């Protein structure tokens, strides 16, 4: 028996689950409220300059999971790329993440790796900060950017989210540690378009999900936000949102893909020069984005989930409501209130599809979550 | 018919020429005077640390030649590797080659690209029409300050001559970059063989018709036993050095071991004329996909190549070219031999270029059997 499957969202979670089940003969309907595919991975060529623009912010693919890598390489041509981020602060330019060049340049030293460790220990001694990393360093790259990014003081408990960056005592300046890293040649929209290209998948855009639909389907995969599915009945989960002031420059505006600004007294958080994500292409005109962080309010796009104490308690109420549902599975960053990379999203969507396909063969019930959230 | 073929040397020239011929039936005999294969691309693991050491200098593979890239991908697993060189000078650490980061750190600014062009244009002297020396090239395009900080001391160490005595071409190959890219090489294909260049050359050498004899010098009486000789030893040596030795710079690699990360990168240049080594290399960073606790490191020193040193860099100025002409003039009088490779032709040649020339040289000698014509002594220009 082919099942009727509804999928809310056509980003990676939707697309990849949809393709896995379509391939096994199920009848898949995917909807999305936006006028185009790809969720926040979506990109498109600006018309004036023809630069592939990453519409919802710089998107770099990286993973240690060889299955996912192989999986995307069937849908795109991955071009080698390494993300090398720069930062402007105190009238100097630095490489990020904080590596031995940063340390030496910042303190005007010629330290070796070990000498650097000895230097940092003694400079160390908001709270993770002053013990490990010292006054002068704390204030320079971390205080100000935090404040601008999260929107609460650094005097409000860290010890998670800044630990997605690594802290090296070598001159490696690759933002990631992952084994695989690249940039699709024709962009993530075509890679997603290729994942959606199957006869058993029907896609409708500008189509909002409505609870009244549920009963026309055997199962629903929902990758929209968990609080909205329930009418926000216990309150709205906390999200930071982003504004992007776009502009055009005839030239190379900054000389790299991403320049961060660490001083608080600068309004934007970073500027991104989109053509630097396509080194294999040449462009005279340049599309650029100044990027501003705010509190998310009911009209904005939710970007990063805050996950401080309060939002966790509030999340737990929606989790326990979701636990009593029957033909639905919630997935993705928005469905589970988690900050997820593309590689982890794709990994979770393949697994979700496999558990479902397994549930039909073994005649068992499909879980509401396929990943840990509680 | 199958031909009898002597190949002198077992680096890329030997291996590649000799594999193309074993593929067309020929009886290839490859000799090398050293007790291992690989020529100056030879790497080997250090006993105590297990780090893969590039024994004759760091060797990084890079090319725009897809055909060559394919070919070595047949004989090794090529790992992605981007050479990112650092430099220590004037009490600081910089990135090389000169880029927007080096410029902004050196002059203490936060220039954009277009502002850096304007900064360097004011420093350069656009009154020099056609820079002929290394010095003139640097004063024209980067200015006195950058010149003296990053190039003068270094060039003196490397070449044993003032930069006003050295050709502009040497520096022409490194234009200033006005963005933040610090990859050393502009090339499209770039990497490092996972099992190292020895295993790679071993693979090239692993064919039915090929026998390799190591610790075996060439002897002139061997010619007679073969239909043709491919020679990639030094040209002056073949002729007994009878006119003099071709000029070379040599290198001393001074080994030491550290328990940990000694410098934190593969390559660190010392640009001051007053630090005696040109650089320090830390070989494990050439294998970043591996993990090692102990590190093999080298300090490199450059000096004139003497009678018993290994020749690394050809000098190639008038006198040396005069001398070369004397050996060319009698190489031109040989009948069943072809000089190839960096040593055979007194040129510096990267790996990809060397491999391309070997493919060409094998092609040419097959092309010339089907046409019963004479195989020339060089398959490349040398005059
Ligand atoms: C600023 C920024 C920058 C980056 C990244 C995130 C952010 C916020 N990411 C993370 C990456 O964007 C993320 O993993 C993927 O977007 C997850 O894709 P999903 O399909 O799960 O959700 P995604 O959010 O993309 O898709 C949800 C889709 O469902 C639709 N939808 C929602 N509610 C609906 C409703 N009720 N009815 C109908 N449709 C609805 C939406 O329109 C949307 O299209 C990233 N990752 C990475 O690996 N490298 C990177 O560099 C970056 N860069
Ligand atoms: C310091 C330094 C650093 C580098 C490089 C060169 C130098 C000097 N190279 C260049 C690279 O080394 C060069 O391309 C190859 O070694 C060429 O190999 P050949 O086989 O042509 O000569 P090669 O010199 O390697 O081999 C000649 C062989 O002939 C043997 N021989 C000589 N006389 C003999 C005799 N009479 N009898 C028997 N055997 C004899 C020798 O023992 C030797 O094995 C390089 N290239 C690159 O692409 N990337 C890089 O990073 C570097 N790095
Ligand atoms: O200069 C910085 C940068 C980060 N942070 C802290 O560390 C976190 C870093 O998180 P991310 O860089 O991952 O934030 P983004 O999601 O916006 O970055 C996204 O865009 C980047 C483009 O360079 C990468 O692709 C990255 O992997 C992708 O998550 C920040 O939120 C902030 O808490 C700072 O204090 N200073
Ligand atoms: O820090 C440096 C690096 C290189 N060079 C000069 O540039 C030349 C080219 O050097 P490179 O290492 O780039 O290429 P290769 O030595 O392999 O030909 C050297 O001989 C030097 O004279 C320099 O002056 N300072």
PDB file of N, CA and C in Angstrom, chain B residues 2-70:
ATOM      1  N   UNK B   2      58.783  -5.260 -29.573  1.00  0.00           N
ATOM      2  CA  UNK B   2      59.190  -4.817 -28.242  1.00  0.00           C
ATOM      3  C   UNK B   2      60.630  -4.283 -28.274  1.00  0.00           C
ATOM      4  N   UNK B   3      60.845  -3.130 -27.641  1.00  0.00           N
ATOM      5  CA  UNK B   3      62.175  -2.487 -27.654  1.00  0.00           C
ATOM      6  C   UNK B   3      62.888  -2.612 -26.289  1.00  0.00           C
ATOM      7  N   UNK B   4      64.221  -2.678 -26.317  1.00  0.00           N
ATOM      8  CA  UNK B   4      65.029  -2.697 -25.088  1.00  0.00           C
ATOM      9  C   UNK B   4      65.350  -1.261 -24.641  1.00  0.00           C
ATOM     10  N   UNK B   5      64.936  -0.917 -23.419  1.00  0.00           N
ATOM     11  CA  UNK B   5      64.976   0.485 -22.967  1.00  0.00           C
ATOM     12  C   UNK B   5      65.584   0.668 -21.578  1.00  0.00           C
ATOM     13  N   UNK B   6      66.672   1.433 -21.546  1.00  0.00           N
ATOM     14  CA  UNK B   6      67.329   1.822 -20.284  1.00  0.00           C
ATOM     15  C   UNK B   6      66.832   3.225 -19.831  1.00  0.00           C
ATOM     16  N   UNK B   7      66.394   3.315 -18.597  1.00  0.00           N
ATOM     17  CA  UNK B   7      65.945   4.587 -18.072  1.00  0.00           C
ATOM     18  C   UNK B   7      66.845   4.879 -16.917  1.00  0.00           C
ATOM     19  N   UNK B   8      67.527   6.004 -16.986  1.00  0.00           N
ATOM     20  CA  UNK B   8      68.353   6.401 -15.838  1.00  0.00           C
ATOM     21  C   UNK B   8      67.631   7.310 -14.869  1.00  0.00           C
ATOM     22  N   UNK B   9      67.304   6.737 -13.704  1.00  0.00           N
ATOM     23  CA  UNK B   9      66.654   7.424 -12.605  1.00  0.00           C
ATOM     24  C   UNK B   9      65.231   6.984 -12.377  1.00  0.00           C
ATOM     25  N   UNK B  10      64.821   6.999 -11.124  1.00  0.00           N
ATOM     26  CA  UNK B  10      63.540   6.512 -10.720  1.00  0.00           C
ATOM     27  C   UNK B  10      62.650   7.554  -9.961  1.00  0.00           C
ATOM     28  N   UNK B  11      62.830   8.835 -10.275  1.00  0.00           N
ATOM     29  CA  UNK B  11      61.838   9.841  -9.906  1.00  0.00           C
ATOM     30  C   UNK B  11      60.735   9.882 -10.970  1.00  0.00           C
ATOM     31  N   UNK B  12      59.909  10.923 -10.950  1.00  0.00           N
ATOM     32  CA  UNK B  12      58.845  11.068 -11.945  1.00  0.00           C
ATOM     33  C   UNK B  12      59.303  10.930 -13.378  1.00  0.00           C
ATOM     34  N   UNK B  13      60.464  11.463 -13.761  1.00  0.00           N
ATOM     35  CA  UNK B  13      60.767  11.356 -15.182  1.00  0.00           C
ATOM     36  C   UNK B  13      60.844   9.843 -15.576  1.00  0.00           C
ATOM     37  N   UNK B  14      61.672   9.102 -14.838  1.00  0.00           N
ATOM     38  CA  UNK B  14      61.919   7.701 -15.124  1.00  0.00           C
ATOM     39  C   UNK B  14      60.613   6.936 -15.133  1.00  0.00           C
ATOM     40  N   UNK B  15      59.938   7.016 -14.000  1.00  0.00           N
ATOM     41  CA  UNK B  15      58.748   6.246 -13.738  1.00  0.00           C
ATOM     42  C   UNK B  15      57.741   6.466 -14.843  1.00  0.00           C
ATOM     43  N   UNK B  16      57.468   7.720 -15.183  1.00  0.00           N
ATOM     44  CA  UNK B  16      56.397   8.010 -16.087  1.00  0.00           C
ATOM     45  C   UNK B  16      56.823   7.603 -17.477  1.00  0.00           C
ATOM     46  N   UNK B  17      57.974   8.057 -17.942  1.00  0.00           N
ATOM     47  CA  UNK B  17      58.348   7.627 -19.250  1.00  0.00           C
ATOM     48  C   UNK B  17      58.243   6.091 -19.289  1.00  0.00           C
ATOM     49  N   UNK B  18      58.805   5.436 -18.285  1.00  0.00           N
ATOM     50  CA  UNK B  18      58.992   3.990 -18.329  1.00  0.00           C
ATOM     51  C   UNK B  18      57.724   3.162 -18.206  1.00  0.00           C
ATOM     52  N   UNK B  19      56.678   3.760 -17.662  1.00  0.00           N
ATOM     53  CA  UNK B  19      55.389   3.138 -17.563  1.00  0.00           C
ATOM     54  C   UNK B  19      54.641   3.230 -18.900  1.00  0.00           C
ATOM     55  N   UNK B  20      54.731   4.359 -19.581  1.00  0.00           N
ATOM     56  CA  UNK B  20      54.075   4.504 -20.863  1.00  0.00           C
ATOM     57  C   UNK B  20      54.610   3.474 -21.866  1.00  0.00           C
ATOM     58  N   UNK B  21      55.840   3.027 -21.654  1.00  0.00           N
ATOM     59  CA  UNK B  21      56.464   2.175 -22.647  1.00  0.00           C
ATOM     60  C   UNK B  21      56.235   0.711 -22.344  1.00  0.00           C
ATOM     61  N   UNK B  22      56.069   0.417 -21.062  1.00  0.00           N
ATOM     62  CA  UNK B  22      55.768  -0.922 -20.628  1.00  0.00           C
ATOM     63  C   UNK B  22      54.325  -1.221 -20.995  1.00  0.00           C
ATOM     64  N   UNK B  23      53.551  -0.164 -21.239  1.00  0.00           N
ATOM     65  CA  UNK B  23      52.153  -0.287 -21.615  1.00  0.00           C
ATOM     66  C   UNK B  23      52.022  -0.628 -23.132  1.00  0.00           C
ATOM     67  N   UNK B  24      53.085  -0.393 -23.888  1.00  0.00           N
ATOM     68  CA  UNK B  24      53.080  -0.643 -25.319  1.00  0.00           C
ATOM     69  C   UNK B  24      53.989  -1.826 -25.681  1.00  0.00           C
ATOM     70  N   UNK B  25      54.263  -2.697 -24.706  1.00  0.00           N
ATOM     71  CA  UNK B  25      55.045  -3.923 -24.926  1.00  0.00           C
ATOM     72  C   UNK B  25      56.533  -3.928 -24.598  1.00  0.00           C
ATOM     73  N   UNK B  26      57.125  -2.754 -24.386  1.00  0.00           N
ATOM     74  CA  UNK B  26      58.592  -2.616 -24.353  1.00  0.00           C
ATOM     75  C   UNK B  26      59.301  -3.119 -23.080  1.00  0.00           C
ATOM     76  N   UNK B  27      60.561  -3.523 -23.206  1.00  0.00           N
ATOM     77  CA  UNK B  27      61.272  -4.123 -22.065  1.00  0.00           C
ATOM     78  C   UNK B  27      62.078  -3.069 -21.314  1.00  0.00           C
ATOM     79  N   UNK B  28      61.430  -2.479 -20.321  1.00  0.00           N
ATOM     80  CA  UNK B  28      61.966  -1.297 -19.667  1.00  0.00           C
ATOM     81  C   UNK B  28      62.802  -1.673 -18.469  1.00  0.00           C
ATOM     82  N   UNK B  29      64.047  -1.237 -18.516  1.00  0.00           N
ATOM     83  CA  UNK B  29      64.989  -1.433 -17.430  1.00  0.00           C
ATOM     84  C   UNK B  29      65.344  -0.058 -16.812  1.00  0.00           C
ATOM     85  N   UNK B  30      64.953   0.112 -15.542  1.00  0.00           N
ATOM     86  CA  UNK B  30      65.074   1.383 -14.837  1.00  0.00           C
ATOM     87  C   UNK B  30      66.050   1.257 -13.689  1.00  0.00           C
ATOM     88  N   UNK B  31      67.139   2.012 -13.790  1.00  0.00           N
ATOM     89  CA  UNK B  31      68.162   2.010 -12.755  1.00  0.00           C
ATOM     90  C   UNK B  31      68.230   3.341 -11.990  1.00  0.00           C
ATOM     91  N   UNK B  32      68.575   3.246 -10.714  1.00  0.00           N
ATOM     92  CA  UNK B  32      68.768   4.425  -9.904  1.00  0.00           C
ATOM     93  C   UNK B  32      69.955   4.249  -8.957  1.00  0.00           C
ATOM     94  N   UNK B  33      70.777   5.292  -8.836  1.00  0.00           N
ATOM     95  CA  UNK B  33      71.984   5.176  -8.033  1.00  0.00           C
ATOM     96  C   UNK B  33      71.738   5.269  -6.544  1.00  0.00           C
ATOM     97  N   UNK B  34      70.540   5.649  -6.135  1.00  0.00           N
ATOM     98  CA  UNK B  34      70.230   5.740  -4.710  1.00  0.00           C
ATOM     99  C   UNK B  34      69.588   4.432  -4.287  1.00  0.00           C
ATOM    100  N   UNK B  35      69.528   4.159  -3.000  1.00  0.00           N
ATOM    101  CA  UNK B  35      68.999   2.874  -2.590  1.00  0.00           C
ATOM    102  C   UNK B  35      67.445   2.832  -2.442  1.00  0.00           C
ATOM    103  N   UNK B  36      66.733   3.758  -3.103  1.00  0.00           N
ATOM    104  CA  UNK B  36      65.281   3.789  -3.091  1.00  0.00           C
ATOM    105  C   UNK B  36      64.765   4.525  -4.304  1.00  0.00           C
ATOM    106  N   UNK B  37      63.476   4.375  -4.576  1.00  0.00           N
ATOM    107  CA  UNK B  37      62.849   5.048  -5.699  1.00  0.00           C
ATOM    108  C   UNK B  37      62.405   6.506  -5.333  1.00  0.00           C
ATOM    109  N   UNK B  38      61.905   7.261  -6.306  1.00  0.00           N
ATOM    110  CA  UNK B  38      61.242   8.534  -5.987  1.00  0.00           C
ATOM    111  C   UNK B  38      62.001   9.799  -6.348  1.00  0.00           C
ATOM    112  N   UNK B  39      63.282   9.678  -6.656  1.00  0.00           N
ATOM    113  CA  UNK B  39      64.063  10.860  -6.925  1.00  0.00           C
ATOM    114  C   UNK B  39      63.851  11.833  -5.764  1.00  0.00           C
ATOM    115  N   UNK B  40      63.853  13.123  -6.077  1.00  0.00           N
ATOM    116  CA  UNK B  40      63.757  14.098  -5.029  1.00  0.00           C
ATOM    117  C   UNK B  40      62.347  14.301  -4.485  1.00  0.00           C
ATOM    118  N   UNK B  41      61.374  13.499  -4.960  1.00  0.00           N
ATOM    119  CA  UNK B  41      60.001  13.466  -4.426  1.00  0.00           C
ATOM    120  C   UNK B  41      59.844  12.434  -3.315  1.00  0.00           C
ATOM    121  N   UNK B  42      60.880  11.617  -3.129  1.00  0.00           N
ATOM    122  CA  UNK B  42      60.884  10.588  -2.067  1.00  0.00           C
ATOM    123  C   UNK B  42      60.476  11.084  -0.690  1.00  0.00           C
ATOM    124  N   UNK B  43      59.490  10.432  -0.091  1.00  0.00           N
ATOM    125  CA  UNK B  43      59.147  10.643   1.296  1.00  0.00           C
ATOM    126  C   UNK B  43      59.250   9.307   1.995  1.00  0.00           C
ATOM    127  N   UNK B  44      59.308   9.320   3.318  1.00  0.00           N
ATOM    128  CA  UNK B  44      59.495   8.116   4.119  1.00  0.00           C
ATOM    129  C   UNK B  44      59.116   8.448   5.550  1.00  0.00           C
ATOM    130  N   UNK B  45      58.712   7.438   6.298  1.00  0.00           N
ATOM    131  CA  UNK B  45      58.265   7.669   7.649  1.00  0.00           C
ATOM    132  C   UNK B  45      59.413   7.652   8.626  1.00  0.00           C
ATOM    133  N   UNK B  46      59.398   8.600   9.543  1.00  0.00           N
ATOM    134  CA  UNK B  46      60.376   8.665  10.585  1.00  0.00           C
ATOM    135  C   UNK B  46      60.140   7.590  11.712  1.00  0.00           C
ATOM    136  N   UNK B  47      61.206   6.862  12.074  1.00  0.00           N
ATOM    137  CA  UNK B  47      61.104   5.711  13.006  1.00  0.00           C
ATOM    138  C   UNK B  47      60.365   6.007  14.289  1.00  0.00           C
ATOM    139  N   UNK B  48      60.775   7.046  14.969  1.00  0.00           N
ATOM    140  CA  UNK B  48      60.275   7.357  16.300  1.00  0.00           C
ATOM    141  C   UNK B  48      58.888   8.006  16.335  1.00  0.00           C
ATOM    142  N   UNK B  49      58.542   8.806  15.318  1.00  0.00           N
ATOM    143  CA  UNK B  49      57.325   9.608  15.373  1.00  0.00           C
ATOM    144  C   UNK B  49      56.296   9.125  14.371  1.00  0.00           C
ATOM    145  N   UNK B  50      56.707   8.323  13.386  1.00  0.00           N
ATOM    146  CA  UNK B  50      55.780   7.867  12.345  1.00  0.00           C
ATOM    147  C   UNK B  50      55.248   8.974  11.401  1.00  0.00           C
ATOM    148  N   UNK B  51      55.813  10.180  11.509  1.00  0.00           N
ATOM    149  CA  UNK B  51      55.498  11.246  10.585  1.00  0.00           C
ATOM    150  C   UNK B  51      56.131  10.981   9.194  1.00  0.00           C
ATOM    151  N   UNK B  52      55.298  11.113   8.140  1.00  0.00           N
ATOM    152  CA  UNK B  52      55.722  11.043   6.762  1.00  0.00           C
ATOM    153  C   UNK B  52      56.593  12.307   6.432  1.00  0.00           C
ATOM    154  N   UNK B  53      57.864  12.063   6.176  1.00  0.00           N
ATOM    155  CA  UNK B  53      58.811  13.134   5.958  1.00  0.00           C
ATOM    156  C   UNK B  53      59.111  13.206   4.462  1.00  0.00           C
ATOM    157  N   UNK B  54      59.083  14.426   3.949  1.00  0.00           N
ATOM    158  CA  UNK B  54      59.482  14.789   2.579  1.00  0.00           C
ATOM    159  C   UNK B  54      60.980  15.082   2.685  1.00  0.00           C
ATOM    160  N   UNK B  55      61.775  14.159   2.186  1.00  0.00           N
ATOM    161  CA  UNK B  55      63.165  14.052   2.557  1.00  0.00           C
ATOM    162  C   UNK B  55      63.987  15.112   1.804  1.00  0.00           C
ATOM    163  N   UNK B  56      63.616  15.417   0.557  1.00  0.00           N
ATOM    164  CA  UNK B  56      64.307  16.459  -0.167  1.00  0.00           C
ATOM    165  C   UNK B  56      63.548  17.775  -0.255  1.00  0.00           C
ATOM    166  N   UNK B  57      62.853  18.164   0.803  1.00  0.00           N
ATOM    167  CA  UNK B  57      62.084  19.405   0.741  1.00  0.00           C
ATOM    168  C   UNK B  57      60.585  19.123   0.631  1.00  0.00           C
ATOM    169  N   UNK B  58      59.788  19.951   1.275  1.00  0.00           N
ATOM    170  CA  UNK B  58      58.357  19.833   1.147  1.00  0.00           C
ATOM    171  C   UNK B  58      57.978  19.779  -0.329  1.00  0.00           C
ATOM    172  N   UNK B  59      57.026  18.893  -0.643  1.00  0.00           N
ATOM    173  CA  UNK B  59      56.546  18.671  -1.995  1.00  0.00           C
ATOM    174  C   UNK B  59      55.024  18.788  -2.066  1.00  0.00           C
ATOM    175  N   UNK B  60      54.531  19.875  -2.647  1.00  0.00           N
ATOM    176  CA  UNK B  60      53.100  20.055  -2.720  1.00  0.00           C
ATOM    177  C   UNK B  60      52.675  19.994  -4.154  1.00  0.00           C
ATOM    178  N   UNK B  61      51.713  19.135  -4.436  1.00  0.00           N
ATOM    179  CA  UNK B  61      51.245  18.950  -5.783  1.00  0.00           C
ATOM    180  C   UNK B  61      50.264  20.036  -6.284  1.00  0.00           C
ATOM    181  N   UNK B  62      50.509  20.649  -7.414  1.00  0.00           N
ATOM    182  CA  UNK B  62      49.605  21.666  -7.937  1.00  0.00           C
ATOM    183  C   UNK B  62      49.666  21.827  -9.458  1.00  0.00           C
ATOM    184  N   UNK B  63      48.509  21.937 -10.084  1.00  0.00           N
ATOM    185  CA  UNK B  63      48.475  22.019 -11.544  1.00  0.00           C
ATOM    186  C   UNK B  63      47.139  22.531 -12.025  1.00  0.00           C
ATOM    187  N   UNK B  64      47.173  23.116 -13.218  1.00  0.00           N
ATOM    188  CA  UNK B  64      45.982  23.431 -14.000  1.00  0.00           C
ATOM    189  C   UNK B  64      45.694  22.336 -15.063  1.00  0.00           C
ATOM    190  N   UNK B  65      46.582  21.348 -15.144  1.00  0.00           N
ATOM    191  CA  UNK B  65      46.551  20.316 -16.159  1.00  0.00           C
ATOM    192  C   UNK B  65      45.699  19.128 -15.730  1.00  0.00           C
ATOM    193  N   UNK B  66      44.460  19.101 -16.206  1.00  0.00           N
ATOM    194  CA  UNK B  66      43.529  18.078 -15.800  1.00  0.00           C
ATOM    195  C   UNK B  66      44.039  16.694 -16.157  1.00  0.00           C
ATOM    196  N   UNK B  67      44.732  16.604 -17.278  1.00  0.00           N
ATOM    197  CA  UNK B  67      45.219  15.316 -17.750  1.00  0.00           C
ATOM    198  C   UNK B  67      46.218  14.708 -16.725  1.00  0.00           C
ATOM    199  N   UNK B  68      47.129  15.547 -16.225  1.00  0.00           N
ATOM    200  CA  UNK B  68      48.122  15.150 -15.232  1.00  0.00           C
ATOM    201  C   UNK B  68      47.427  14.803 -13.899  1.00  0.00           C
ATOM    202  N   UNK B  69      46.512  15.694 -13.512  1.00  0.00           N
ATOM    203  CA  UNK B  69      45.717  15.456 -12.326  1.00  0.00           C
ATOM    204  C   UNK B  69      44.995  14.104 -12.371  1.00  0.00           C
ATOM    205  N   UNK B  70      44.335  13.810 -13.488  1.00  0.00           N
ATOM    206  CA  UNK B  70      43.730  12.500 -13.635  1.00  0.00           C
ATOM    207  C   UNK B  70      44.773  11.407 -13.384  1.00  0.00           C
TER     208      UNK B  70
END
